[PDB]
Structure formats: C-alpha cells, structure tokens
Write a protein that binds this ligand. Structure first.
Ligand code: HEC
Length: 108
C-alpha cells in the first residue's frame, strides 16, 4: 500500500491539462501521439494494437496497476529509459493519486 484514493474530479482535469495532448481514454478512442489508454489497467506495456511503441516499453513489460503507474508518472524516462513518452512527470504524490483515481475509472 503506497497509493491511496484521490479526487476523480481533480483527476479528470489533470488528465485534460497534462495528458490529453497525446492520449484518449475512451473505448473506441483513437491512438494519437500516445496510444489510446482504454483498458490499460492489468495489461502489460506495449500491447495496444495499431500503435508503434518503442523497443524499450515493450521489453520493459510492465503490468499496469495503480502503483506501477504511480512510479511511472513520477518520471517516465527514469522508469523506462528509452521511452518516446516526452512528459517530465508529476512530482506531487497527491496529483498522481487524483490522476490514477480518474484513470482507474475512465479507462474501464
Ligand atoms: C505526449 C507529449 C505525451 C504526454 C503529454 C503523455 N504521454 Fe503517455 N505516452 C506517450 C507516448 C508517445 C507513449 C508511448 C511511448 C513509447 O515508448 O512507445 C506513451 C505511453 C504511455 C503509457 C504506457 C502505455 C502502454 O500501452 O503500455 C501510459 C500508461 C501513459 N502514456 C500515460 C500517460 C498519462 C497518464 C499522461 C498524463 C499524466 C501521459 N501519458 C502524458 C505520449 C505522451
């Protein structure tokens, strides 16, 4: 236990301001700069079809849980060196909590 529940509402707005540029979350949403995140929870990394992921993410083969995602979100390139994901990261654990709270919900 190193992830506690946040604000889905707060979560949804962070997504909009920090993730939307590159990703969609809805089932049936298109891949953009980053892949569509529908159903990411429980899936391994690099497995969405029709998306050209880097060697690195695929090979990293991470099982996406609220906790994994948390460390990833902190500093992506640090987590998976070689990832084409160009996001500095979210240093506050509270932003991270709210975003994942949103994500758990909207990608289901
Ligand atoms: C564009 C400038 C991006 C922003 C802002 C965010 N992400 Fe991203 N993401 C992007 C790319 C190009 C990729 C693929 C990387 C690669 O090496 O192929 C990713 C990947 C992800 C993943 C891993 C997905 C998988 O299918 O395993 C996740 C979980 C993810 N991105 C989430 C995410 C969130 C929540 C963001 C906002 C905080 C976000 N990313 C920003 C491009 C971009």
């Amino acid at each position: 236990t190193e992830f506690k529940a946040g604000s889905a509402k707060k979560g949804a707005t962070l997504f909009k301001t920090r993730c939307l540029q590159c990703h969609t979350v809805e089932k049936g949403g298109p891949h953009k700069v980053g892949p569509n995140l529908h159903g990411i929870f429980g899936r391994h990394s690099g497995q969405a079809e029709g998306y050209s992921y880097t060697d690195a993410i695929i090979k990293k083969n991470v099982l996406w849980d609220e906790n994994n995602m948390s460390e990833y979100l902190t500093n992506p390139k640090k987590y998976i060196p070689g990832t084409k994901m160009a996001f500095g990261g979210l240093k506050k654990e509270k932003d991270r909590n709210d975003l994942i709270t949103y994500l758990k919900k909207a990608t289901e």
